[PDB]
Amino acid sequence: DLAHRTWGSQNSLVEMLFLRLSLPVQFTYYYSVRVFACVWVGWVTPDYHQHDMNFDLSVTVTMGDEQGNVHSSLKCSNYMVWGSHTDLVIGCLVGLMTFTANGKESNTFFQVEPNTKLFPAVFVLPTHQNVIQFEAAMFLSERKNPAPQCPPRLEVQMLMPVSWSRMPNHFLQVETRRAGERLGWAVQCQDPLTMMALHIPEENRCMDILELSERLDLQRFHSHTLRLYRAVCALGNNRVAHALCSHVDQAQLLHALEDAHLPGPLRAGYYDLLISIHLESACRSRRSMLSEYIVPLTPETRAITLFPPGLPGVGVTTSLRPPHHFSPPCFVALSPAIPLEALRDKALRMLGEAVRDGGQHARDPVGGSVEFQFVPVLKLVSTLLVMGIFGDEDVKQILKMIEPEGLLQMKLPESVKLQMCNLLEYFCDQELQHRVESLAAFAERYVDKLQANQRSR
C-alpha cells in the first residue's frame, strides 16, 4: 500500500500471462493499471476459456420488429481491450464502462451490460521486470459487501488468478445413453442422470461434488458449511429450517443418500443434514416422551400377553407419545415435511446396500472409509426408528439384518459400533417398552378381576 502491487518476470521464459483478477462486479469506481513497460487491460466476463495470443478479441445481438428494423442493439462482451516509460490505464465503471489511458479520456469502447459479472483483468505478454501495477470512489468500496465505504481497504481475497490452460476435472460416472438411428438421422436418448453439482458464486463456474473430493480444501470448506447448516437447526429452530430447505433441497438430500461416489466428510454432512433440517426436531420431541411410558386403557392396549402365543419387533406399540406433525416447506406466503414412507425404504435400502457388499469385504469403501459407510446410515436409521417410523415388519428386516434370527457379527470401526450401540439401545428400550406396557395391561385386567372381588365384600 496508495493501493497497488509490484511485479516481475525473473525467468528465461516470457510466454503468456492472463491476469484475470478474482473479484467480479455486478450492477465512479476507478481501476488503474500502471505499467512500467503493448498491454491488454480489460474487464472480462467470467466465462473465458481461450489461451492464445490471437487478439482482438473474440458479439452484437439484435431484436426484430416482425419486419426487422431497430430496437435491436445489445452488447458485445466476451470483453474489454487496450494497446517509452510509465503507462496508466484506468477502467472506471458506474451503467457503462469508461476508459482513460494515461489519465486522458479515450473511452467510447465496449460498455453495455444489463446486470452481469465482470472480473477485472489484464492480459499481458511480459517485458520482464515491473510489468504491471493496479489500484471517484475506490473499487474496493464496491466489490466487497460493506458498500459504500469510500476509503480503500486492500483485501486478502484480492488474488491474481492466471488462466491456467489445463486444469483437471471429473471423468463422470455413468452418463447418457447415446443413440442415433440412420433413418433420417434421428438422434435419441432415454434414461436421465443428475450431477451432484454446485457453483462458486464469488467467481461463477459449475462443478460437480464428485469432482470435489480431490479439491480437499474445498470439501473442507463445504463440509463445514454443512456443519453450519446442521448447527443452525439445533433443536426446533424450524423458522430457519424452512429456509435451509430452500438452501439444500429435498431431492438433493435424497441423491446425497444415494451415490457412493460422494466423499466421506460431505457424506456424513448431508446425512446429518437430513437429521437437522428435517428429521431432528421431531425425534428430539419423541425422546423424553418415549421415555414417559404412559399408557391408555383402550382394548388394543389391553392384550398384551408379554410373551407372544419373544421378539423386540412386536407391533403392539400402544402408549401415547404425541405424533410429530409436519408443515411442508413452501415460499409463497414451523416443522418441515419429508416423504417419510419413501425415505424409510431408502434408509433400509441403504442399509442392505452396505451391509451386503461390506459383508463381502470390499475396499472402495463407499465413503472412503467404513466409518463413513455406516455411521451416517446407522445414525439416520437410528433416529428414523426412534421416531416410531418404520412398520414393524421392516423392523423385523432390521433384526434379520442384525441378529440374524450380516452386520453386528462383523468387525467394525469404533464409531460404527457406537452408533450401533445406540440403535441396539433403542431396541432394548423397545423391550422395556413392551414390558412396562404388558404390565400395565395386566394391571388393567387384574384391577377388573379385583374390583369384581371388591363388591363381594
Binding site: 386403557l297 404390565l439 384391577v447
Partner: protein, 275 residues
C-alpha cells in the same frame, strides 16, 4: 374407578413383588467381565476413573457409575476351614477388582466429589468398603502407593469436608419429627478399613499426609465429628432426662447415633490400634 386402581396397583406392586431378588445376577455379570490388553471390567473401571479425573468440578449424578459401583459392591473344625475358605473367596472377589485398579477409581472418585454428598460418594464408599471389608492388605498397599504417587491432595480435602458435613443426632429436628447415618457410618468404616490390618505407614499417612502441599490431619477430624456427635448425644439425653419412658422413635433414632459412635470410636481404635 378404572385407571385409579390401576395406578395404585402398579405403585403398590412396585414396592411389593418387584422385590424378590433377581439381584443374584451381579456376580455372574462381573464374572463375565473377567474373561480375557485390558479386560472389560478393567475397561469399566478405567472409564469411570477417567470420568472422575475430569475437571467437572461439580459431578453429575452419573447413573451408570451408580449402577456399576453398586454392582461391584454387591460382588462381595469344619466351620473354621469354611470360614477361611470364605476369606479366600472374599479375597478373590477383591482381587477381581483391585488388580483391575478399582481401588484407584474409588479413591479418585472420592477425591472428585469434594464436599458434595450425593448418592455418588455414598456408592463409592460402599465400593471401597466392599473392596476392603476384610482388612485387605494389598488394596491398602495400592491405595497408599497411589496417594503417594499422584499427590492428588484433594482426597483428604474431600473427606475432611465430608465430616464437616456428615450428620449428627440433632435436637430440634427430632422435635419436628415427634409431632442420615448410613453414609457417615460407611465413611468411618472406610477409613477404619484403610487402617485395619495395622498399616503403620498409612496411619501415619493419615496423620499428616507427607508430600502433599496441604497437610490435613484427618484423625483430628474424626475426633471432631465424635465430639459434635457427643454433644448431640448429651443433648438428646437431657431432652429425655425427665420423661423416663422413651418413645420408640427416640429409640431407633438413638440406636442410630449409638451405631455411629460405635463405628467412629472403632475408627479411632484402628487409627491407634498399632503401637
Amino acid at each position: 374407578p378404572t385407571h385409579r386402581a390401576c395406578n395404585m396397583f402398579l405403585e403398590s406392586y412396585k414396592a411389593a413383588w418387584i422385590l424378590t431378588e433377581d439381584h443374584s445376577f451381579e456376580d455372574r455379570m462381573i464374572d463375565d467381565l473377567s474373561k480375557a490388553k485390558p479386560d472389560p471390567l478393567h475397561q469399566l473401571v478405567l472409564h469411570f476413573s477417567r470420568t472422575a479425573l475430569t475437571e467437572k468440578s461439580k459431578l453429575d449424578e452419573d447413573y451408570l457409575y451408580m449402577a456399576y459401583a453398586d454392582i461391584m459392591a454387591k460382588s462381595c473344625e469344619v466351620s473354621f476351614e469354611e470360614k477361611e475358605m470364605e476369606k479366600q473367596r472374599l479375597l478373590y472377589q477383591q482381587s477381581r477388582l483391585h488388580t483391575r485398579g478399582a481401588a484407584e477409581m474409588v479413591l479418585q472418585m472420592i477425591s472428585a466429589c469434594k464436599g458434595e454428598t450425593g448418592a455418588m460418594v455414598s456408592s463409592t464408599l460402599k465400593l471401597g468398603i466392599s473392596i476392603l471389608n476384610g482388612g485387605n492388605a494389598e488394596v491398602q498397599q495400592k491405595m497408599l502407593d497411589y496417594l503417594k504417587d499422584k499427590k492428588e491432595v484433594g482426597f483428604f480435602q474431600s473427606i475432611q469436608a465430608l465430616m464437616q458435613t456428615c450428620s449428627v443426632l440433632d435436637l430440634n429436628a427430632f422435635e419436628r419429627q415427634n409431632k442420615d447415618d448410613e453414609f457417615t457410618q460407611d465413611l468411618f468404616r472406610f477409613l477404619q478399613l484403610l487402617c485395619e490390618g495395622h498399616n503403620n505407614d498409612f496411619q501415619n499417612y493419615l496423620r499428616t499426609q507427607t508430600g502433599n502441599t496441604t497437610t490435613i490431619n484427618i484423625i483430628i477430624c474424626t475426633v471432631d465429628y465424635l465430639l459434635r456427635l457427643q454433644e448431640s448425644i448429651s443433648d438428646f439425653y437431657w431432652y429425655y432426662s425427665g420423661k423416663d419412658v422413651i418413645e420408640e422413635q427416640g429409640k431407633r433414632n438413638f440406636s442410630k447415633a449409638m451405631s455411629v459412635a460405635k463405628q467412629v470410636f472403632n475408627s479411632l481404635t484402628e487409627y491407634i490400634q498399632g503401637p
